[PDB]
Amino acid sequence: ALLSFERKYRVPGGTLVGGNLFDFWVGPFYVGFFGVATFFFAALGIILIAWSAVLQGTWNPQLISVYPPALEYGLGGAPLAKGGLWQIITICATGAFVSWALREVEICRKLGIGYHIPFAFAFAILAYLTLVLFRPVMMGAWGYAFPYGIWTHLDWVSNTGYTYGNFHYNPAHMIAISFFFTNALALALHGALVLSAANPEKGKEMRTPDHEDTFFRDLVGYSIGTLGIHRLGLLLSLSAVFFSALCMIITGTIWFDQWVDWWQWWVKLPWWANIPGGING
Amino acid sequence: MSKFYKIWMIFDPRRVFVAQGVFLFLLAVMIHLILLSTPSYNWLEISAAKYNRV
Amino acid sequence: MSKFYKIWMIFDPRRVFVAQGVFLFLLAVMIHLILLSTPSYNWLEI
Amino acid sequence: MSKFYKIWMIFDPRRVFVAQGVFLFLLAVMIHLILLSTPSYNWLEI
Amino acid sequence: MSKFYKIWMIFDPRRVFVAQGVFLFLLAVMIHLILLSTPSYNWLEISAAKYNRV
Amino acid sequence: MSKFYKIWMIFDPRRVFVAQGVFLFLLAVMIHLILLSTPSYNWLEISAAKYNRV
Amino acid sequence: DLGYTGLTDEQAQELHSVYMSGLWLFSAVAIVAHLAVYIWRPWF
Amino acid sequence: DLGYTGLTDEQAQELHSVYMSGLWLFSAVAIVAHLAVYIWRPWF
Amino acid sequence: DLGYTGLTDEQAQELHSVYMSGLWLFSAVAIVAHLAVYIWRPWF
Amino acid sequence: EYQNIFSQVQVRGPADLGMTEDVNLANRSGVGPFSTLLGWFGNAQLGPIYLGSLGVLSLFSGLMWFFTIGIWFWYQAGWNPAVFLRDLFFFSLEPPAPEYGLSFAAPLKEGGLWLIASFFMFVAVWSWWGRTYLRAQALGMGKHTAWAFLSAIWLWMVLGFIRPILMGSWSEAVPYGIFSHLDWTNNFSLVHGNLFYNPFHGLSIAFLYGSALLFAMHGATILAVSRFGGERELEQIADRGTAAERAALFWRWTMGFNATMEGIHRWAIWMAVLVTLTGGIGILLSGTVVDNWYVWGQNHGMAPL
Amino acid sequence: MVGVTAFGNFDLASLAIYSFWIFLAGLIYYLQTENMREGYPLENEDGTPAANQGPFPLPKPKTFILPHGRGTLTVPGPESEDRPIALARTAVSEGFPHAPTGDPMKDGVGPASWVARRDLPELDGHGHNKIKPMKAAAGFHVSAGKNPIGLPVRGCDLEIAGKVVDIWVDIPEQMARFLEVELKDGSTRLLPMQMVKVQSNRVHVNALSSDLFAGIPTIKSPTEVTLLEEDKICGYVAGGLMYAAPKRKSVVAAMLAEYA
Amino acid sequence: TIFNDHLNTNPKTNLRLWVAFQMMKGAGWAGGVFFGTLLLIGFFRVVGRMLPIQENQAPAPNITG
Amino acid sequence: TIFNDHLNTNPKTNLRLWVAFQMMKGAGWAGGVFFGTLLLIGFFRVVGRMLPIQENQAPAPNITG
Ligand SMILES: CCCCCCCCCCCCCCCCCC(=O)OC[C@H](COP(=O)([O-])OCC(O)COP(=O)([O-])OC[C@@H](COC(=O)CCCCCCCCCCCCCCCCC)OC(=O)CCCCCCCCCCCCCCCCC)OC(=O)CCCCCCCCCCCCCCCCC
Ligand code: BCL
Ligand SMILES: COC(C)(C)C/C=C/C(C)=C/C=C/C(C)=C/C=C/C(C)=C/C=C/C=C(C)/C=C/C=C(\C)CC/C=C(\C)CCC=C(C)C
Ligand SMILES: COC(C)(C)C/C=C/C(C)=C/C=C/C(C)=C/C=C/C(C)=C/C=C/C=C(C)/C=C/C=C(\C)CC/C=C(\C)CCC=C(C)C
Ligand SMILES: COC(C)(C)C/C=C/C(C)=C/C=C/C(C)=C/C=C/C(C)=C/C=C/C=C(C)/C=C/C=C(\C)CC/C=C(\C)CCC=C(C)C
Ligand SMILES: COC(C)(C)C/C=C/C(C)=C/C=C/C(C)=C/C=C/C(C)=C/C=C/C=C(C)/C=C/C=C(\C)CC/C=C(\C)CCC=C(C)C
Ligand SMILES: COC(C)(C)C/C=C/C(C)=C/C=C/C(C)=C/C=C/C(C)=C/C=C\C=C(C)\C=C\C=C(/C)CC/C=C(\C)CCC=C(C)C
Ligand SMILES: [Fe+2]
C-alpha cells in the first residue's frame, strides 16, 4: 500500500485543475485530472495499434506497422485504413505525453519540489513533435513522418538518412552525437563513483564526498562536484535532444543536397581554396 | 443477484464512477472507430455512395 | 431518473462543471476533425 | 478617449448590452452570407 | 472445492477484483479482435458479403 | 509425497499464488497461439474449410 | 445521505434542476443544428 | 457486516438502486439505438 | 486461520457466496452467447 | 524562481589537497589555478593530479600515438601548413590493404605507421585502465569505475583488435581520422546489410537512449530536491532525509515504482555499461556469423518478407 | 562460421540474443532487489503491514560502517519515524488524502515535512564540521557574483522581513549554503540558497512572507548546523510554497484566483 | 436559493456574469430568430423535394439577361 | 462594486450565471489550447511556404503500400 514514510506526504492541494475531484490515488499512482486524461489517451492509442494489427493482417508484434498517409494526401485527412489511424494515434500520443507532463507538474507541486522533471520531459516531447508534426507540416505532407512499427520506423530512419547521402556529415548531427556519447560516459562514471564510495573495499568504512573528489582529481585532475555532475547530466541530455531536433528541422527544409557538400565551404575558403596537394585538390 | 449491493461496501463510489465513465467513453470510441474503419458500416462513405457525393 | 439529483451530494459542482466543459469542447473538436477527414463532409474544401 | 466611460452615465447598460448582442450576432450572420455567396470562400459547397 | 472460500483470507478483495476486471476485459478484447482478423468469423465482412453491401 | 505440504513453510502463499496464476495464463496463451499458428490445429481455418466458409 | 461534498437534499435538487435546464437547452440547440445539417445534407 | 468504505447497509442499497436505475436507462437507450441500426442495416 | 487480509470465517463465506452468484450469472450469459453463436455458425 | 542551473554567487578559500590514506603523495602534484568560468557550473579548483608509473606509461604511449597520427597527417599534406589547416578533417591513417592479411609486412606507407600507432594506442588505453583500478584501490574504494571502463574497452578492442583477427585481416579495423572513421562506420553498415537489423545493435541503441533518458531523469530529480540538500547523496544513503523521500514518492506516484538514493546508481551504471557490452557482441557477430543482417531479419520474423 | 545453424535458424546470433534476454531478466530482478532497501515492508494507511509486499522479495541485509565513529547502518531494517504525524484521514477507504489537523507547516506534514535524522553535524573527510559561517571559516571570501551580505530580504508579499548578515559555506565543496538573515527581532534565521533569488539591490524569497520568517526553526548552536535542523529549516521553507500561497502577491495567481 | 456555495465569489465577477448574461439574452433571441427562419426554409425545401417538381419543371418567368 | 444595478436580479439567476461561467472557464481554457496549437501549425506552414521546399522536393521515406 504505502511506503513506511509516505503517509505524512499524502496531503490535499497542489493541483492545477479540478480541486479534489481526482485528487486521489489508485494504488501507488496519483490520478488527478491529467492522470484521467493520460490514461484515456494511452488506452485509446494502444487499442488503435491493436486494431491496426487486425486490419494489416499480422499478429507478430515486430511486424505490426501503422503507416502515415501517403504523399498525395498532403496535409489533409486520409481513410482510417490507409493513413487515418496513424493520425488518430498521433493525436492520442501527443495528448498522452502532454497530460503526463502536466500530471508530473501536479505531483512535483504537491511535494514541494522544483519542476525540473516536467521541464526535461518537454524537451523529448518537442523532439517527437519535430519528427511527427513540425517537419512534415513545414515540408508538405504527413508522409514524411515515421510509421509506428518496431522495425519499420528504422526503415524510415535509414531512408531519410540516405536521401542526403551519409547523414554523418550533418554538423548539428555531429554535435548531438557528441553530446549523447558524453552523456553515456558521464552516467557510467557517476554511477561507478557513487557506488564505489558507498561500497568500499570490503569491510572497511564507508567513504565520503572528499574521497570522491580525491579519486577523480587523482584520475584526471579536476573534480566537478555533486551539484556539478547533476547539472552537467541534465544539460548534456537536454543539449543532445535539442541538437537532434535542430539537425532534423533543418534537413530537407533549408538543406536539400549531400551534407559533405555543406562541409565543402571550409575547403573553398579564400586563403587555401587553390593550393595543390592534400586530400582536396 | 439480490445482494450485489454489498459491492459498495467494498469499493468507494467516487473512484468506481470515475473509472466507469472513462471506460464507457473509451469503449464507445473504440466501437465507433472500428465501424468507421470498415468500408461497410462506415456510415459516412455509405451515404456518400448512396447520394453520389464523390 | 427522478432522483438523479443526488449525484450532486456525491460530486462537487465546480470540479464537475470544469471537467464537463473541457470534455464537451474536446469532443466537438474531435468530431469536427472526423468530418474534416472524409473527402465529403470536409467543408473546408474550396 | 480617456473619459469615454461617461457614455454609461448617458445609456442604461442593460438596454445597450441587449442591443449590442443582437447587433453583433446579426452582423456575423451577414458576413457569413457574404462569404457564402462568392464561389470561393463558400464552405457549404461540400 | 467446498472451502475454496479461504482464498479470501489470503487475498484482499479490492486488488483481486480490480485485477479480475482488467483481465476479463483484456481477454474479451483479445478474442473479439482475433475473430475480426480472420476472413471468416469477421462478422462484419460476413454480413457485407451476405447482403451484397459491396 | 505425503509431506510435500512443508513447501508452505518454505514459501509465502501470496507470492507463490500470484506467480502460479501468471505462469498458468502465460502457458495457456503460449499453447493456444502455437496451435493457431500451424495450418492444422488452427481450428478457425479448419472449420472454415470443412463448412466451406471461404 | 453520504455527503462527501457536504450538500443537503434541497441544495442537491436545486442544483440538479438548474443543471438539467441547461442540459436541455444545450440539447435543443444541438437538435436544431442536427436537423439543419440533415436537411442540408443527409448521412443516412 | 463487512466494511471497507464505511457505508452502511441502507446507504449501500440506496446507492445501488439509483445506480441500477441509471444503468437500465442507459441500457434502454442502447437497445433503441441498436434496433434502429439493425433495422437500418443488419449485421447478421 | 491465517488472517492476512483481516476477514473472519463468516465474512469470507458471505463474500465468496455473493462472488459465486455473480460468477455463475456471468457464466450463464456466456453460455447463452456461445450457444447463439454456435447455432448461428459452428466452429467444430 | 532560482533553477539551480548556475551558481549565483561563488566562494573560495584554501585549496583541498584531498584525502591521504595509502596514497603516495610524492606522486601527487601541486594544486593548480582556480577557474571562475568553471566555478559557475561546478568546482573551480584544478588539480592536483596524480602522476605514477602507469600515469607516465599512459602519457608516453598516448602522446606518441597522437604524434604519429599527426606526423602522418603532415606528410599527407605535403608539409604545407595551409593544407594541413584546410584538410585536417579529411586526413586519414588507414590500415594495411586486405592482401597483407594479418601480417606485419605491410610497407611503412600503406599501414606500417597504422600498426605502430595502434600499438601505442593499445598500451595507452590499457595503462589508463590499470591506472583507474589503482587510483580506486589507493583510497580504499570499490572498483566499479574499472569495470565500467572495461566495458568500454571491450567495445574498443572488438572494433580494433579482435574482429580483425577473426576475419583474418588488418584491413577491417578503424582508420585514424575524423571523416575517414565516419565513412568506415557507414561502409561497415553498407557491407553487412543494415546494421539496423542487427538485434544487438538495436539493444545498444536502446541502452544509449536509456542512458540519456535516465540521466535527464536523475539530474532533474536531484536538482528538484536540491532544496532539501538532495545533491549530498552519500549522506542521504547514510542517513535518509526528506529529499530522498520526496524523490522516491514523486517517481512512485508517477510510474508506480521508485528507487533508492543508492540504487538509482546501480541502474545508472548498468544502463551505461550495457551500451558497449551489447555493441561489442553485435560487432563481433557482424561478419563472423552474419554477413547480411536484413536477410537474417527476414529469416527471424523481423522484416516483412 | 558464417551461417551454419544448430537447429532451424538458430545460430550464434540467436544464442547470443536469447542469452542476453535471460541475463537482462536477471539483472532487472537484481536491480529492483537492491532498490527495495528503503521504505519496505509496505504498510496500510493506519500503520499496520499491508497484505501487499510485492512479487520481489526483500534482499538480505548489508551493513554500512559509518565514518568518524558514527556507528553502523544496516539495511533493510526496522523503520519507524520517531516523531508524531498530525494528520487525520479523509475517507475510510484507501488512496485518499490525509488532511492536517492543526497548522500544516509547522507540525511539519506535507510539503513542509521533515525527517528525524541524527542531531549532529555532518563532517568533512578530516573530521571537522562540513558547513560553517564565513566568519568561522579561515580564508573564504565572496569570489564572484553579487555579494549578498548587507542586502535587505523581501518576502513573497513584497515586505522586507530582515537583511543578510553572513553566508554559510560548505568547506570542501566550496559553495554557499545558507544566508544568515537577521530580523529586527534581532535573532537570526537560516535561508537555503536555492530558495533565494539574489538580485542587484534585494534578496527575494518567493517561498515565505515576512510573518513566516520568524517561525523558521532556529539553530541550536550559533556556528554550526546539524542534519535534523537542516531538514527542519528546509522543510518549512519549501512547504511555504503551498502553505503560504494565499499570502503571496503574484500577478498570475491573482489572475487565476479572481477568475476562479 | 439554499445552495450558498456560489455566493462566495467576489462582487466584480458577479457583475461580469451579469453582463455576459445580458449579451446572451440579446443574441440568443437573435439566434433563435435566424435558426427558426432556416428551419422554415428547410421545411419548404423538403416539401419541394418530395413533390414531382423535379421532373416536370417550369421555364424561367423573367429574363435576367 | 458600486454599480448596484446588477444586484437586483434574483438569486436563482445568479446561480445560473455562476455555472455558465464555470463551463466557459473550463472550455475557454480548452479552446485556447486548441487554437494556439493551430496557430503554431500555421506558423510552421507559412515558414514552409516561404522556403524553396516547393521546388526541390524529397522522395517518400516510407512505402505506405
Ligand atoms: C546454475 C544453473 C545455470 C544457470 C546459468 C545462467 C545464469 C543466469 C544469470 C542471469 C543474470 C543474473 C543477474 C546478473 C547481473 C548481476 C549483477 C550483480 O549481481 O552485481 C553484484 C555486484 C555488486 O558489487 P558491490 O556489492 O557493489 O561491491 C561491493 C564490494 O565492497 C566492492 O566490490 P568490487 O569493487 O571489488 O567489485 C567487484 C565486482 C563488482 O562489479 C561492480 O562493481 C559493478 C560493475 C558493473 C559492470 C560490470 C560489467 C563489466 C564488463 C566486463 C567486460 C565486458 C565484455 C565481456 C565479454 C562479453 C560476453 C561475451 O566486479 C565484477 O563482478 C565485474 C567483473 C567483470 C568481469 C567480466 C569478464 C567476462 C565475463 C565473464 C563472466 C563472469 C563475470 C564475473 C562473475 C563473478 C563476479 C564476482 O556486482 C557484480 O558482481 C557485477 C556482475 C558481473 C556479471 C557479468 C558481467 C558481464 C555480463 C555479460 C552478459 C552477456 C549475456 C549473453 C550475451 C552473449 C552470449 C553469447
Ligand atoms: C550508417 C551507419 C549505421 C551505423 C553503424 C554503426 C557501427 C558500425 C557501430 C555503431 C555503433 C553504435 N551506434 Mg550505430 N549506425 C547507424 C545508426 C545509429 C543510430 C541512429 C538513430 O540512426 C544510433 C542512435 C546509433 C547508435 C549507436 C550506438 C548505440 C553504438 C555506439 C556505442 C558508443 O558509444 O560507441 C562509442 C564508444 C566507443 C567506440 C568506445 C571507446 C572506448 C575507448 C577506451 C576510448 C579511448 C579514447 C582514446 C584513447 C582517445 C583519448 C582522447 C583524449 C583523452 C582527449 N547508430 C547506422 C545503421 N553504429 C557501434 C556498435 O556497438 O554497434 C553494435 C558500432 O561499432
Ligand atoms: C541444446 O542442448 C540440448 C538441449 C540439446 C541439451 C541440453 C542439455 C542440458 C545440459 C541438460 C541439463 C539438465 C540438468 C542438469 C538436469 C537437472 C535435473 C535436476 C537437478 C532437477 C531437479 C528436480 C527436482 C524438483 C522436481 C524438486 C521437487 C521437490 C518439490 C516437489 C518439493 C521439495 C522442496 C522442499 C525440499 C520440500 C519442503 C521441505 C520442508 C521439510 C521444509
Ligand atoms: C469516434 O467516435 C465518434 C466521435 C465518431 C462517436 C463517439 C461519440 C461519443 C461516444 C459520444 C459521447 C457523448 C457524450 C456522452 C455526450 C454527453 C453530453 C453531456 C452530458 C452534455 C451535458 C451538457 C450540460 C449542459 C451544458 C448544462 C448546462 C448547465 C448550465 C450551464 C447551468 C445554468 C443553466 C443556464 C446557464 C442555462 C439556462 C438559464 C439561462 C440564464 C439561459
Ligand atoms: C475489439 O473488441 C470489440 C470492440 C469488437 C468488442 C468489445 C467487447 C468488450 C468486452 C465490451 C465490454 C463491455 C462492458 C463489459 C459493458 C459494461 C456495461 C456496464 C457495466 C456499464 C454501466 C453503465 C451504467 C451507468 C450508465 C450508470 C449510470 C448511473 C448514473 C446516471 C448515476 C448513478 C450513480 C450514483 C449511484 C447515483 C447517486 C448515489 C446516491 C445514493 C448518493
Ligand atoms: C490466443 O489465445 C486464445 C485467445 C485463442 C485462447 C485463450 C485462452 C485463455 C487461457 C482463456 C482464459 C480464460 C480465463 C482463465 C477464464 C476465467 C474466468 C473466471 C475466473 C472469471 C470470473 C468471473 C466472475 C466475475 C464476473 C464476478 C462477478 C461478481 C460481481 C458481480 C460481484 C461479486 C464481487 C463481490 C464478492 C460482491 C460483494 C461482496 C460483499 C458481501 C462484501
Ligand atoms: C601539429 O600537430 C601535431 C602534428 C604536433 C600533432 C597533432 C596531431 C593531430 C592531427 C592528431 C589527429 C588524430 C586523429 C584525428 C585521431 C582519430 C582517432 C580515431 C577517431 C580513432 C577511432 C577509432 C580507433 C579505435 C577503434 C582503434 C582501436 C585499435 C585498438 C583495439 C588497438 C589495436 C591493436 C593493434 C592492431 C595491435 C598491433 C600490435 C603491434 C605489434 C603493431
Ligand atoms: Fe547521483
Short mmCIF file of N, CA, C and O and ligand atoms in Angstrom, two decimals, chain A residues 157 162 168 181, chain J residues 65 121 125 149 152-153 155-156 159 184-186 188-189 195-196 201 204-205 208-209 275-276 279-280 282-283, ligand 2:
data_model
loop_
_atom_site.label_atom_id
_atom_site.label_comp_id
_atom_site.label_asym_id
_atom_site.label_seq_id
_atom_site.Cartn_x
_atom_site.Cartn_y
_atom_site.Cartn_z
N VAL A 157 14.11 5.83 -40.70
CA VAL A 157 15.37 6.48 -40.34
C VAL A 157 16.40 6.27 -41.44
O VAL A 157 17.08 7.21 -41.87
N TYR A 162 19.64 8.36 -45.89
CA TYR A 162 20.31 8.15 -47.16
C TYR A 162 19.74 9.01 -48.29
O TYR A 162 20.34 9.05 -49.37
N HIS A 168 26.05 11.34 -41.56
CA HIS A 168 27.09 11.67 -40.59
C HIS A 168 27.65 13.07 -40.79
O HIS A 168 28.22 13.63 -39.85
N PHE A 181 27.19 10.66 -26.62
CA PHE A 181 28.30 9.83 -26.15
C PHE A 181 28.86 10.36 -24.84
O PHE A 181 29.17 9.59 -23.92
N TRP J 65 51.11 8.06 -29.83
CA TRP J 65 50.03 7.74 -30.75
C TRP J 65 49.53 8.99 -31.46
O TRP J 65 49.43 9.04 -32.70
N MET J 121 48.47 3.11 -29.07
CA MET J 121 47.13 3.29 -28.54
C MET J 121 46.75 2.15 -27.60
O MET J 121 46.13 2.38 -26.55
N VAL J 125 45.75 2.89 -23.68
CA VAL J 125 44.42 2.60 -23.13
C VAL J 125 44.51 1.58 -22.00
O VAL J 125 43.87 1.74 -20.95
N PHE J 149 34.78 1.01 -17.24
CA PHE J 149 35.80 1.25 -18.24
C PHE J 149 36.13 -0.02 -19.01
O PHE J 149 36.44 0.03 -20.20
N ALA J 152 33.73 -0.38 -21.82
CA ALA J 152 34.11 0.49 -22.94
C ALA J 152 35.30 -0.09 -23.71
O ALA J 152 35.33 -0.09 -24.95
N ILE J 153 36.29 -0.59 -22.98
CA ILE J 153 37.47 -1.21 -23.58
C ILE J 153 37.10 -2.45 -24.36
O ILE J 153 37.73 -2.77 -25.37
N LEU J 155 34.32 -2.91 -26.11
CA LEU J 155 33.88 -2.46 -27.43
C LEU J 155 35.07 -1.99 -28.27
O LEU J 155 35.16 -2.31 -29.47
N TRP J 156 35.98 -1.22 -27.67
CA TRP J 156 37.14 -0.71 -28.40
C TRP J 156 38.01 -1.84 -28.95
O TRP J 156 38.42 -1.82 -30.11
N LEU J 159 36.36 -3.61 -31.86
CA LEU J 159 36.43 -2.81 -33.08
C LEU J 159 37.81 -2.86 -33.71
O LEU J 159 37.93 -2.99 -34.94
N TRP J 184 34.15 4.83 -42.46
CA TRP J 184 34.31 3.43 -42.08
C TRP J 184 33.04 2.90 -41.44
O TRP J 184 32.61 1.78 -41.72
N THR J 185 32.44 3.70 -40.56
CA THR J 185 31.18 3.31 -39.93
C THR J 185 30.08 3.10 -40.97
O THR J 185 29.40 2.06 -40.97
N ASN J 186 29.92 4.06 -41.88
CA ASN J 186 28.87 3.95 -42.89
C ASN J 186 29.09 2.75 -43.80
O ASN J 186 28.14 2.04 -44.16
N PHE J 188 30.86 -0.02 -43.12
CA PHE J 188 30.58 -1.22 -42.34
C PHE J 188 29.09 -1.52 -42.35
O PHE J 188 28.68 -2.68 -42.53
N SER J 189 28.26 -0.50 -42.17
CA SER J 189 26.82 -0.74 -42.25
C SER J 189 26.41 -1.21 -43.64
O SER J 189 25.60 -2.13 -43.77
N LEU J 195 22.83 -2.56 -40.43
CA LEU J 195 23.00 -2.82 -39.01
C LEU J 195 21.74 -2.54 -38.22
O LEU J 195 21.65 -2.97 -37.07
N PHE J 196 20.78 -1.82 -38.80
CA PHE J 196 19.52 -1.60 -38.11
C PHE J 196 18.83 -2.91 -37.79
O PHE J 196 18.04 -2.96 -36.84
N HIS J 201 22.75 -4.47 -32.11
CA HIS J 201 22.78 -3.05 -32.45
C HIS J 201 21.55 -2.33 -31.93
O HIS J 201 21.66 -1.23 -31.37
N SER J 204 21.93 -2.00 -28.18
CA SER J 204 22.88 -0.95 -27.86
C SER J 204 22.24 0.43 -28.00
O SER J 204 22.45 1.31 -27.16
N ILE J 205 21.46 0.63 -29.06
CA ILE J 205 20.76 1.90 -29.23
C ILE J 205 19.73 2.09 -28.13
O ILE J 205 19.54 3.21 -27.63
N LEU J 208 21.65 3.28 -25.13
CA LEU J 208 22.13 4.66 -25.26
C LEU J 208 20.99 5.66 -25.06
O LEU J 208 21.13 6.66 -24.34
N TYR J 209 19.84 5.40 -25.69
CA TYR J 209 18.66 6.21 -25.44
C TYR J 209 18.25 6.15 -23.97
O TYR J 209 17.83 7.16 -23.40
N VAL J 275 25.40 -0.50 -23.05
CA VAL J 275 25.60 0.08 -24.37
C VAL J 275 26.76 -0.60 -25.08
O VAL J 275 26.59 -1.27 -26.10
N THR J 276 27.96 -0.48 -24.51
CA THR J 276 29.13 -1.04 -25.16
C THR J 276 29.19 -2.55 -25.02
O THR J 276 29.78 -3.21 -25.88
N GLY J 279 26.97 -3.66 -27.80
CA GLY J 279 27.60 -3.21 -29.03
C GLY J 279 28.78 -4.08 -29.44
O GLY J 279 28.93 -4.43 -30.61
N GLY J 280 29.64 -4.42 -28.48
CA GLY J 280 30.74 -5.31 -28.77
C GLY J 280 30.27 -6.66 -29.25
O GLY J 280 30.82 -7.22 -30.21
N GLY J 282 27.44 -7.36 -30.77
CA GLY J 282 26.88 -7.21 -32.10
C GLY J 282 27.94 -7.07 -33.17
O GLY J 282 27.85 -7.69 -34.23
N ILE J 283 28.97 -6.26 -32.91
CA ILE J 283 30.03 -6.08 -33.89
C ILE J 283 30.83 -7.37 -34.07
O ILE J 283 31.24 -7.72 -35.18
C1 BCL N 2 25.17 4.19 -41.49
C2 BCL N 2 25.72 3.98 -40.10
C3 BCL N 2 25.00 2.85 -39.34
C4 BCL N 2 25.59 2.56 -38.00
C5 BCL N 2 26.82 1.99 -37.80
C6 BCL N 2 27.43 1.63 -36.57
C7 BCL N 2 28.59 0.86 -36.35
C8 BCL N 2 29.47 0.26 -37.41
C9 BCL N 2 28.73 0.81 -34.97
C10 BCL N 2 27.69 1.54 -34.43
C11 BCL N 2 27.64 1.62 -33.03
C12 BCL N 2 26.73 2.29 -32.26
N1 BCL N 2 25.73 3.01 -32.87
MG1 BCL N 2 25.06 2.83 -34.91
N2 BCL N 2 24.84 3.13 -37.00
C13 BCL N 2 23.68 3.58 -37.57
C14 BCL N 2 22.68 4.23 -36.82
C15 BCL N 2 22.60 4.58 -35.45
C16 BCL N 2 21.62 5.44 -34.79
C17 BCL N 2 20.53 6.10 -35.50
C18 BCL N 2 19.41 6.83 -34.80
O1 BCL N 2 20.46 6.11 -36.72
C19 BCL N 2 22.01 5.44 -33.43
C20 BCL N 2 21.40 6.12 -32.23
C21 BCL N 2 23.16 4.65 -33.32
C22 BCL N 2 23.87 4.40 -32.15
C23 BCL N 2 24.95 3.59 -31.88
C24 BCL N 2 25.50 3.33 -30.52
C25 BCL N 2 24.45 2.67 -29.64
C26 BCL N 2 26.69 2.41 -30.77
C27 BCL N 2 27.99 3.00 -30.23
C28 BCL N 2 28.17 2.99 -28.73
C29 BCL N 2 29.17 4.01 -28.37
O2 BCL N 2 29.04 4.83 -27.59
O3 BCL N 2 30.25 3.91 -29.08
C30 BCL N 2 31.30 4.89 -28.84
C31 BCL N 2 32.25 4.32 -27.81
C32 BCL N 2 33.35 3.70 -28.11
C33 BCL N 2 33.86 3.44 -29.51
C34 BCL N 2 34.26 3.16 -27.01
C35 BCL N 2 35.61 3.85 -26.89
C36 BCL N 2 36.40 3.35 -25.70
C37 BCL N 2 37.88 3.70 -25.69
C38 BCL N 2 38.54 3.20 -24.41
C39 BCL N 2 38.07 5.21 -25.79
C40 BCL N 2 39.53 5.54 -25.92
C41 BCL N 2 39.75 7.03 -26.13
C42 BCL N 2 41.06 7.33 -26.86
C43 BCL N 2 42.27 6.92 -26.05
C44 BCL N 2 41.13 8.83 -27.08
C45 BCL N 2 41.58 9.68 -25.94
C46 BCL N 2 41.18 11.14 -26.14
C47 BCL N 2 41.78 12.14 -25.15
C48 BCL N 2 41.70 11.50 -23.75
C49 BCL N 2 41.08 13.50 -25.15
N3 BCL N 2 23.53 4.15 -34.56
C50 BCL N 2 23.55 3.15 -38.98
C51 BCL N 2 22.66 1.94 -39.15
N4 BCL N 2 26.88 2.07 -35.37
C52 BCL N 2 28.70 0.61 -32.59
C53 BCL N 2 28.16 -0.62 -32.03
O4 BCL N 2 28.43 -1.04 -30.93
O5 BCL N 2 27.33 -1.26 -32.83
C54 BCL N 2 26.73 -2.50 -32.39
C55 BCL N 2 29.49 0.33 -33.88
O6 BCL N 2 30.60 -0.21 -33.85
#
